[PDB]
RNA sequence: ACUCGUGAGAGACUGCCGGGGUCAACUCGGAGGAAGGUGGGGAUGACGUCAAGUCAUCAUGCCCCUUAUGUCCAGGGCUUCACACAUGCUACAAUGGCCGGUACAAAGGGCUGCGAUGCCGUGAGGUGGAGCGAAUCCUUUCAAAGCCGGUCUCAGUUCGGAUCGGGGUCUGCAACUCGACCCCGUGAAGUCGGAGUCGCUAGUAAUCGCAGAUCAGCAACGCUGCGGUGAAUACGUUCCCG
């Protein structure tokens, strides 16, 4: 998560392969996900606090 | 050590709302990202301000920003030269435009987040720790009608080289029962000698409110 | 005319009765041939020894879910309930026996950090 | 029975006896026996030296068997040891060649263990 | 026909928001089918609860989505000005179909 | 199975090497391919990383991309 | 469920074609698992193999070798001061029915037929006669509870 | 009308009867009832512990680099291998293998995505685009184990699929080091596993497929879930463990 890689993942790259998601609020490379773009632990922190729209916790 | 589940995300469903409202297909990552720079954007004025609550209800493509603070007066500073700066930096920043809402808290000491503010805030200036907490209580015990608080204190309190951990309390705040309309406030103190991060639990009361 | 809803694991069965000598209508295929494992076929037709009506009075059924059992035991309970929905004085005679009553055991929720169900990684402390 | 150079055995179907040369698994019993016309359920005690006749001819004919596939092969297994390729490394040193696990596993190409 | 399909998070502002389109669509008058369960959809999240190793001992994470339906048969302009006239909660997304 | 690739920097410099009937050792950063049999005779240094390999290149080698007649790692066990 | 007490047990439903309890609990003790059908057929073909060497009733035949492995007495392991005690102890009836229907399972899973249905069909026909393996069980722990009668008196 | 879908509501409270209870709590049985006594499972981790984990999610005090300990790219490595451990998967066969016929799920996923009938292949797939931002279209009307039938006759085998050779397809600028999948051949160890040791008390164990997230592709036998078929035993606290 250095600005170098942060900066570099959001410029356009020379190939398609070589474009990768890297959560936007941290720059954590690994355990990302698509819908949100907010890493595990951004997910949590951010989800706990309320500040995505109804991602709850869950239990069936 | 303590596993205890962030309060306000133990009860998102319940009783206290989502900060964040709207909906989104599609459309969901670009309106994550917005949300997070708005937060940033709106961290370090306001947290001079004296913010506590950052709500953004979205309609179609708007944007509607609203912020709960302490002092309508350091937000509005003159009449769209500090509101319609940060207002406009906004619209700039994200790809949108800004129907910016301000609004005062009725009691500033009764919200858990401005608690933790005016406490961590006191502990960065060098007065007694324990003097502090003991006094960010009083005051709020009261006031309006507020039937706990619970104030923990952990880092390096006083510049010591132990991170000591204190925990102090009056009344009832029971985390266990869902109907329990808990305002929870963590801020982070910033001395030279480190942070000393504070929680802050408030107990307002029974009422489910259904 | 009666219909009756039986509810087994995730299975469903909606049999209704009409008086007549003995027929079976699952879903376009006979009681034989739509369970062939002659187990069920008793699991079945209990509710009919119990208050002996076996042959003349009969089930006209459709289902839905669960697997070949799930179906059988729901169809158990759906002719079972459609016996009170006949005559209920059969009603004490059915519930005696063990009948009425569905079997609230389902299939209970894998946990984090097992196999499956209440089982734990195996470990071998050093 | 006796065929391209595989001893057939007393009682075996000839989708099975088939399979015991070196060229020939199940599959090419399912197609030599639809191409040739030899039931599949016959038993080798049963066989006729006119169907190994034309089945000997067929399957020498349009398909390799023994020495073929055997010296035949380790002409391409040598090829790729002489010109120097890294396959042609891991045949060198004992190695599993398709570049898979060689840390824990892959005991079948070093063999039988010593342990130090 | 028009046919209202919406969506949202909280069932509550959208029994709510249904009852305002059947109270104002009911109001101007007109043949309108009442408010249709859909059923949901749900995403099921599993987050690794720590900022390093613990695989076991997660949390996951659902999310619900509400789906309500209202078809409009026999649509007069003077019903179709009020749709696009007022949408109250704004948590609700509303697909015209 | 169809076009297979063809390394074009290789390409562009291996059609001059053998238009002047020249035969220079050369320096080559590429492993990925030994795509069509005008690279017979012509001698590759391969480059591993660190160091350059010179690697014959005969007519046995097509269908043999061209980085592993030099290998990457190096293990002796004792 | 131990510990708090004796825990109530699932009642077991009677066979269809044979029509009894002890036909369907070989059926539940014959299920290597997960096909109690084909642990159906399995038990099904061996007790009509049964019929067929017989020519009676198959669940006399089978109660008969049940009855002729069936135990009365099972040692246990308690150990008192620094020696292994061999305890000798009454067998209750379930115990003593799983105890025979268990043994006559896997001791026809030992023996060498081809199928399982001549295996369970042999092993049924020889505790009936009382010449399996099975029977010899019953008279090795027998052994064992005779032999070591003594220290069964600590009325454990 | 029946389901079913999702909204509101009733319903389990020792409430009703019998006995023990100090006439107290509570316990043993019975009735009604879909359910009986915290009905089942979740979410929910008190004060603290262990200087447990993480300065690599982030934030950060202090110290260090600032012509490199920054940064840009190609190639390589993170996949090496005489070993040793650990968690899994496939097995060692007849309750089985292989061929043919046939019946039943639950949940999910889908925009530069899911992609049908048709045609070309043996098959991965190719050509083509119906139709769907989806209780509608597509994932085939969805399964596999199951049932009916045939064959195999106990064997290192019609068990087992590792390995190796040839031949391909797809994804990608690029499958050498290092992708998966299909076809043909090849056909090893392995005959239930020493001391030891692990999981599990009912829709559980065991076994059977299915979907998802991450993802162009996949090392997925992983992880998270969904359902199918479905047991045995618990005499009881002497012993081991907390």
């Not at chain 2, 954007?41 to 912020?67: F, H, M, N, Q, S």
């Not at chain 3, 041939?33 to 459709?62: C, E, G, M, S, W």
């Not at chain 7, 299920?31 to 057929?41: N, Q």
């Amino acid at each position: 998560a250095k600005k170098a890689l942060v900066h570099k993942a959001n410029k356009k790259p020379k190939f398609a392969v070589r474009a990768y998601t890297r959560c936007n609020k941290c720059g954590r490379p690994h355990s990302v996900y698509r819908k949100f773009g907010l890493c595990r632990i951004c997910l949590r922190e951010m989800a706990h606090a309320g500040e995505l729209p109804g991602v709850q916790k869950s239990s069936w | 050590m303590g596993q205890k589940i962030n309060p306000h995300g133990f009860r998102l469903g319940i009783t206290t709302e989502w900060k964040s409202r709207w909906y989104a297909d599609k459309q969901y990552k670009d309106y994550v990202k917005e949300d997070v720079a708005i937060r940033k954007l709106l961290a370090t004025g306001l947290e001079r301000a004296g913010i506590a609550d950052v709500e953004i209800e979205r309609t179609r493509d708007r944007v509607r920003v609203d912020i709960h603070t302490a002092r309508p007066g350091i937000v509005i500073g003159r009449r769209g030269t500090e509101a319609d700066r940060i207002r406009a930096d906004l619209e700039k920043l994200t790809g949108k435009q800004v129907q910016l809402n301000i609004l005062e808290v009725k009691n500033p000491e009764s919200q858990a987040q401005l608690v933790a503010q005016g406490v961590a805030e006191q502990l960065s200036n060098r007065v007694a720790f324990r003097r502090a907490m003991r006094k960010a209580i009083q005051s709020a015990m009261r006031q309006p009608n507020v039937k706990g608080i619970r104030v923990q204190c952990s880092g390096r309190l006083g510049g010591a080289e132990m991170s000591r951990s204190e925990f102090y309390r009056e009344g009832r705040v029971p985390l266990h029962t869902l109907r329990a309309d808990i305002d929870y406030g963590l801020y982070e103190a910033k001395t030279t000698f480190g942070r000393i991060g504070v929680k802050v639990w408030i107990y307002k009361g029974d009422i489910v409110g259904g | 005319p009666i219909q009756t809803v039986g509810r087994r694991k995730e299975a469903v069965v909606r049999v209704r009765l009409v008086p007549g000598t003995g027929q079976f209508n699952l879903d376009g295929r006979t009681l034989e041939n739509y369970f062939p494992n002659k187990v069920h076929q008793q699991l079945i037709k209990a509710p009919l020894v119990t208050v002996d009506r076996v042959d003349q009075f009969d089930i006209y059924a459709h289902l839905d879910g669960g697997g070949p059992s799930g179906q059988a035991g729901a169809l158990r309970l759906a002719i079972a309930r459609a016996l009170i929905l006949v005559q209920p004085e059969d009603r004490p005679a059915l519930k005696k026996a063990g009948f009425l009553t569905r079997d609230p055991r389902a299939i209970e929720r894998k946990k984090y950090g097992l196999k499956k169900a209440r089982k734990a990684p195996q470990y071998s402390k050093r | 029975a006796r065929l391209v150079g595989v001893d057939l055995p007393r009682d075996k179907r000839m989708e099975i006896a088939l399979t015991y040369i070196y060229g020939i698994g199940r599959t090419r019993s399912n197609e030599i026996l639809a191409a040739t016309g030899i039931d599949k359920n016959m038993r080798t005690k049963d066989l006729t030296d006119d169907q190994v006749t034309v089945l000997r001819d067929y399957i020498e004919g349009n398909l390799k068997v023994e020495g073929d596939l055997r010296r035949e092969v380790q002409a391409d297994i040598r090829r790729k040891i002489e010109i120097g390729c890294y396959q042609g490394l891991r045949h060198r040193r004992g190695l599993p060649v398709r570049g898979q696990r060689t840390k824990t596993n892959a005991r079948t190409r070093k063999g039988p263990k010593r342990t130090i | 026909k028009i046919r209202i399909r919406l969506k949202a998070y909280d069932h509550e502002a959208i029994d709510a928001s249904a009852r305002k389109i059947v109270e104002t669509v009911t109001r101007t008058g007109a043949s309108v089918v009442g408010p249709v369960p859909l059923p949901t959809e749900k995403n099921v999240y599993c987050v690794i609860r720590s900022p390093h190793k613990y695989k076991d001992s997660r949390e996951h994470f659902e999310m619900r989505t509400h789906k309500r339906l209202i078809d409009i048969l026999d649509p007069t302009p003077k019903t179709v000005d009020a749709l696009m006239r007022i949408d109250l909660p704004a948590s609700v997304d509303v697909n015209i179909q | 199975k169809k076009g297979p690739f063809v390394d074009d920097h290789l390409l562009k410099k291996v059609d001059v090497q053998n238009e002047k009937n020249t035969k220079q050792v050369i320096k080559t950063w590429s492993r990925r391919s030994t795509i069509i049999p005008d690279f017979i005779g012509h001698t590759f240094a391969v480059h591993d990383g660190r160091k350059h390999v010179p690697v014959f290149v005969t007519e046995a080698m097509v269908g043999h991309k061209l980085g592993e007649f030099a290998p990457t790692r190096t293990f002796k066990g004792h | 469920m131990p510990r708090k007490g004796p825990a109530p047990k699932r009642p077991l439903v009677n066979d269809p074609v044979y029509g009894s309890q002890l036909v369907t609990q070989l059926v539940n003790k014959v299920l290597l698992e997960g096909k109690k059908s084909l642990a159906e057929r399995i038990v099904y073909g061996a007790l009509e193999q049964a019929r067929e060497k017989t020519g009676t009733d198959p669940v006399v035949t089978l109660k008969r070798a049940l009855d002729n492995v069936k135990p009365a007495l099972e040692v246990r392991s308690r150990r008192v001061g620094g020696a292994t005690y061999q305890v000798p102890v009454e067998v209750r009836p379930d115990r003593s029915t799983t105890l025979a229907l268990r043994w006559l399972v896997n001791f026809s899973r030992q023996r060498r037929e081809k199928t399982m249905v001549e295996r369970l069909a042999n092993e049924i026909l020889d505790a009936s006669n009382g010449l399996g393996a099975s029977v010899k069980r019953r008279e090795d722990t027998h052994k064992m509870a005779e032999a070591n009668r003594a220290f069964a008196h600590y009325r454990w």
